[PDB]
C-alpha cells in the first residue's frame, strides 16, 4: 500500500517511547527495588540483554514473529530483514517502522524478566535464557497473537500485549524466581525506602512510554490510538486510586510503592483492553486491576515473605490476567466497547480470553523452564 | 470536521510530553527541593492527586471546562465523555485527544501545588483540596480562558496557560504556604546541594515536556506550533541567562538552582506568549522573566527567610504575571508578534491581560482558601 | 514549498528528543562520571552554555550555518531569523522547525564538550570558549556539511553529524583536556561505581533522544527516517555487544560502564551512516564501533592513566571517525546501502570521508585551541 507520513511519524515516536520503557524505564524501576550491591549488575544485564534482543529481533525474531507461516510461528524469509524493500508498507506505515515497534515490545518484555532476576542469575546464564525464551516463547506467542497465529485466529482480544508481554514475562519471571533462590541479607528484608524515588522515576518513565506502547498498537494516529491513549490515562489513574484505597483500608496508610504498583497494575490491566473498551470500562478495569494487583503481591509476600523485585511479576501476571479477561467483557458496545468480532458473544469471547491466558501461561512456563535448565546445565544459573 | 492524522499524532505525543511534566517531572523537581524525610510522602501525594485529577477530568472536568455553557463553566453533557463519538473532531484532531491534552494541563497544574505543599499537608487533606480547587478554580478558569468563557470573550491572550496553569497554581500554592506552617529543622534552612541534581533532572523533564505543553497548545503541527516551539527554546535560554546574570551580579556567582529557576521562569513567562510573539519578543520576555523570577524568589526569601519548595510559586506567579502582561505587548506585529484581535490596540490588550491576571489571582486565591479550610475543618490540614 | 504537517509533527518531536539529549541526557551522563564535588558546577555550566548556544543559534548561528554563502559559512540575512516568514518551508517542514532542529544539534555538541570539561574550567572561561568554538568551528563545519558548504560539495556522507557533532566535539574536548590539567584526588582514580546508575540513566536518555537525532535528520517521517531509526537500534545494540564482548575477553567480565560506552559508541558510529546503510551494515558498523571505542578509551587510559570524563571524547572521536569511514563503505547497494552519488565509487567516497574527517579534526582543533587560549588570556582557564 502507501505509507501515511503521519502514521510513520506517530509510530516511530511510539517506538521510541516503548524503547524508553526498557532503557531506562524498567532498569530504574528495578534499580530502586534491588539492593545497591546488585544494581550495577542488573543494569548491565538489562542493557546487554536489551542489545541482544534488538539483534535477535532483526536477525530472525521479526521474520518468525510477523512473517506468515502457521499458527505458532512465521517464516525465515525476512532474516536480517531480507526481501523487505525500504518502501514496503505494513498497514499504513513503512514496514521498517513496524519492525522496530514490534522489536521494542520484545525488548520491554525481556526487560521485565531480566530486571527482576538479574541480581540472582549469572550473566552468561541470562544470555542463554533470553535467547531460548525469546526465540521459543516470545516469538511464537507474538506470532500467535499479532502474527495471525493461533490466538488471533480464535479472535483473542489483546490490543497491546496483555498476553504477549505481561503474562508471558510474568510467568517466565515467576518460574525463574521459583528455580533460582536468593539469599536475603539481614536488614534487607524490605525494599529500601531511600531508593524508592528511583522506583517512582522508573514507574513514571514506564507510564510515559506506555502511551507509545498502548496507543502505538493502533498502528496509526487514528481514533483508536486516541481511545487507547485516553484509556491508558484513565485505567492507570483508576488503578493507582484502587490500589491506594485497598492499601489504605488494609494498612491504614498509602505508600509510594503502592501508588507506583497501582500505576503499573492499571497499565498492565488496560494493555490488552485499551483499544477495545470505553473510558468507563477503562476506569473499572483500572480499579479492579489495582485491587487485584494489591491482592497479587500480598499473596506473593505470603510465599516469599520478603520484599523482592520478583513481586513485580505478581502485578504483571495477575493484572495481565485480569485485564485479558476483562477485555472479553468491556469490549462489548453495551459497555461502550468497540464490539466483538463476527458471531461472537461475550460468553464466547471470555472463553477465548481464558484460552489465550491458559496457553500463554503454559507455553511461557515450559519454555522458561527449559531456558533456565539449559542455562543451568551449561554455565550454571544462580550466582 | 475531519481529523488530520498528523495533528492527531502531534497532539497525542504532546499530551504524553505534558503528562511527562508531572510524572516524573514536577515530582523530581520538588523531590530535590524537599528534605529526604518527606520526599516519599510528596511523591505519593503527587502520584495519587495526579490519578485523582485524571479521573475527575474524564468524569466531569472536561465537560465543565470545555463544554459550552456560560462565562465561568461549561456543562455536564460530557460526563465520563458521554455523547462524544470516538470519531468526533475538535479542531483538527479527535476530541478524545483534546480531552487527554487538556487533562494533562490540569495534572501539571495540580502537580505544581501538591509537589510543593505535600510535605506539610495531611494526605487526606490534599485530596479534599484537589477536588475543591480543581472543580472550582481550575475548571472555571480553564473554561474562562480556553472554553470560550469570560476571559476568552474579552480577548485575553494566553496561548498555553499563563493564567490557567501558572498564576492559578502559584496563588493556590502561596495561600497554602500562608495557611499551612512548616517546621524547618536545624541545618535544613537551605536546599541540600547533594539533592540539586534531582532538581536539575526535574527541570530538564519539565523543559522537554513543556514543548508539548507550549507547541501542543497550537492544537496542530502547524507554523504556530513551530513558532511556539522556537519561542520556548529562546525564552527558556534567555531566562536562564537573565537569571544567571542577575544572580552573578547579585551574588558574584551563578548557581545550579539559579540556572534551573531561570529555565522555569522563561518557560512560565513565554507560556502565555509563545504562539503570539516573535523570537525577538521571546528573548526579551525570557530575559525579563528570568530577572523577574530572581526578584520574586528574593522577595519570598525575605518573608520565609528559608529555602522552601514553595519558593517555586514565586517564579510561577511572578513570571506568570510578567509573561501574561508582556504578551499584551509583544503580540504586536510591530514587534514581530501575530497581532491583536479586531479593533484591539496594545493599550486595550494590556488592560485585558491585567484583568485576566487579576481575576485569576482572586478566583484561585478564594477557591484555594475555601479548599484549605474545608480540608482543615474536615480532616485537618497541617501534618 | 508546502509544509507537510506529518513532517512538521515528526521534526518538532525529534527536536524535542535531541534537546532531551543535552537536557538532561548529557548532564546526567557526565554527572555520573565526575566527582560529586564538581557535579553541581558541571550541571550549571551545561545548563548555561546550553542556554547560550540556543541564543547564539537564533541570533546568527542558524543564518551562518544554513544560510547560503560560500564553502565555509552562510550569511547574516537571517539574524534573529529576520526575513523568515513563519510559513516559510525548508524541505517539507516549516523553516522555524528546521531552525530548532538544527539548533538542538549545536546544543548537544557543545554539551558533549562542556559536560566533560566543566569541572576543570572556570565558568566565565567556558562561556568564552563556547562563543568562539560555536561561532568558528561548529557553525562553519555545520555549514560545510549541512549548509551546502565544502564537504557537502565534495559529496561527504554524514547523515546526522559524525563530523559536525562527534568528531568536532571530540577534538575540541581532547584539546581542552590537553590544555587544561586536572588534579585527581586520592581514591578518585576510578569512576565511582555508586554513581554509575546516573551514567546509565544519561546513556539511556541520549539513546532515546538519539532517535530524534538520527531519524529526524531525514527531515521527514519517510522511509529514510524509518531506516535511520532501525539502524540506530541495531548499531547501538551491536556496539553494546561488541564492546561487552571485547571487554569480556579483555577483562573477564562485562561492566555497566562498558555496556553504556558500547551503546554510545554504536550511536556515534551509526550517526553518519544511519540513513545511507542497510541493517546489515548497521550491525557491522555497530560491532566495529564498539570494539573501536573500547580500543580508544583503552589508549586514552594509557595516557591519562585515570578514569576521566574526557574519556568520552575517545569514544566520540574514534567511533565518530570509524563511523564516517564505514559510511563510505556500507552506503554501497552491494552492501544494502542507499548508493553513492553520481559517478562516485566506494574508493572515491572513502577518500572524501577521510578528507571530511581530516578537515573537521584540524578545523575544530585549531578553533578550540584558539578558543581556550582566548579564554585563558582573558579570564583564565583552569579553575
Curated annotation (Swiss-Prot), chains A, B, C:
Effect of substituting residue 316 to A: Does not prevent transport of ammonia. Loss of transport activity with methylammonium and methylamine. Shows normal GlnK-AmtB complex formation after ammonium shock. Loss of both methylamine and ammonia transport
Cytoplasmic side: 31-41, 119-122, 178-197, 250-255, 298-309
Pfam families in the record: Ammonium_transp (PF00909)
GO biological process, any: carbon dioxide transport
Chain positions of site Important for optimum substrate conductance: 213
Keywords: Ammonia transport, Cell inner membrane, Cell membrane, Membrane, Signal, Transmembrane, Transmembrane helix, Transport
Entry protein name: Ammonium transporter AmtB
Transmembrane portions of the chain: 9-30, 42-66, 96-118, 123-147, 162-177, 198-217, 225-249, 256-276, 279-297, 310-331, 347-375
Binding site for NH4(+): 217
Topology within the bilayer: Multi-pass membrane protein
Gene Ontology terms, MF aspect: ammonium channel activity; identical protein binding
Effect of residue 210 to A: Loss of transport activity with methylammonium as substrate
Effect in UniProt of substituting residue 158 to A: Impairs ammonium transport. Loss of activity with methylammonium as substrate. GlnK remains fully uridylylated and localizes to the cytoplasm during a transient increase in extracellular ammonium
Further remark: Specifically binds 1-palmitoyl-2-oleoyl phosphatidylglycerol (POPG), which increases protein stability. POPG is an essential cofactor for transport activity and, in the absence of POPG, AmtB cannot complete the full translocation cycle. Can also bind phosphatidylethanolamine and cardiolipin-like molecules, leading to positive allosteric modulation.
Function in brief: Involved in the uptake of ammonium/ammonia (NH(4)(+)/NH(3)). Transport is electrogenic. Following sequestration of NH(4)(+) at the periplasmic face, NH(4)(+) is deprotonated and neutral NH(3) is transported into the cytoplasm. Neutral NH(3) and charged H(+) are carried separately across the membrane on a unique two-lane pathway, before recombining to NH(4)(+) inside the cell. In vitro can also transport the larger analogs methylamine and methylammonium. Also acts as a sensor of the extracellular ammonium concentration.
Subcellular localization(s) per the UniProt record: Cell inner membrane
Gene field: amtB
Periplasmic side: 1-8, 67-95, 148-161, 218-224, 277-278, 332-346
Amino acid at each position: 500500500a502507501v505509507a501515511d507520513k503521519a502514521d510513520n511519524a506517530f509510530m516511530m515516536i511510539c517506538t521510541a517511547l516503548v524503547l524508553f520503557m526498557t532503557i531506562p524505564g524498567i532498569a530504574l524501576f528495578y534499580g530502586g527495588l534491588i539492593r545497591g550491591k546488585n544494581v550495577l549488575s542488573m543494569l548491565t544485564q538489562v542493557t546487554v540483554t536489551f542489545a541482544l534482543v534488538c539483534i535477535l529481533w532483526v536477525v530472525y525474531g521479526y521474520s518468525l514473529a510477523s512473517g506468515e507461516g502457521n499458527n505458532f510461528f512465521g517464516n525465515i524469509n525476512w532474516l536480517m530483514l531480507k526481501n523487505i524493500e525500504l518502501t514496503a508498507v505494513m498497514g499504513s506505515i513503512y514496514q521498517y517502522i513496524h519492525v522496530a515497534f514490534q522489536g521494542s515490545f520484545a525488548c520491554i518484555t525481556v526487560g521485565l524478566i531480566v530486571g527482576a532476576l538479574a541480581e540472582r542469575i549469572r550473566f552468561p546464564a541470562v544470555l542463554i535464557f533470553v535467547v531460548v525464551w525469546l526465540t521459543l516463547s516470545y516469538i511464537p506467542i507474538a506470532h500467535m497473537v499479532w502474527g495471525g497465529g493461533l490466538l488471533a485466529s480464535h479472535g483473542a482480544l489483546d490490543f497491546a500485549g496483555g498476553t504477549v508481554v505481561h503474562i508471558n514475562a510474568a510467568i517466565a519471571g515467576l518460574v525463574g524466581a521459583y528455580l533460582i533462590g536468593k539469599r536475603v541479607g539481614f536488614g534487607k528484608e524490605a525494599f529500601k525506602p531511600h531508593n524508592l524515588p528511583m522506583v517512582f522515576t522508573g514507574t513514571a518513565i514506564l507510564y510515559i512510554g506506555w502511551f507509545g506502547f498502548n496507543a502505538g498498537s493502533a498502528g496509526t494516529a487514528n481514533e483508536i490510538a486516541a481511545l487507547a491513549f485516553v484509556n491508558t490515562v484513565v485505567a492507570t489513574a483508576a488503578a493507582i486510586l484502587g490500589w491506594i484505597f485497598g492499601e489504605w483500608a488494609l494498612r491504614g496508610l498509602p505508600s509510594l510503592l503502592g501508588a507506583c504498583s497501582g500505576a503499573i497494575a492499571g497499565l498492565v490491566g488496560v494493555t490488552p483492553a485499551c483499544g477495545y473498551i470505553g473510558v468507563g470500562g477503562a476506569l473499572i478495569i483500572g480499579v479492579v486491576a489495582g485491587l487485584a494487583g494489591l491482592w497479587g503481591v500480598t499473596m506473593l509476600k505470603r510465599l516469599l515473605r520478603v520484599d523482592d523485585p520478583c513481586d513485580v511479576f505478581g502485578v504483571h501476571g495477575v493484572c495481565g490476567i485480569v485485564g485479558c479477561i476483562m477485555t472479553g467483557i468491556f469490549a462489548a458496545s453495551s459497555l461502550g466497547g468497540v464490539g466483538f468480532a463476527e458471531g461472537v458473544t461475550m460468553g464466547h469471547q471470555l472463553l477465548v480470553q481464558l484460552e489465550s491466558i491458559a496457553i500463554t501461561i503454559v507455553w511461557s512456563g515450559v519454555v522458561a523452564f527449559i531456558g533456565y535448565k539449559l542455562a543451568d546445565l551449561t554455565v550454571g544459573l544462580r550466582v
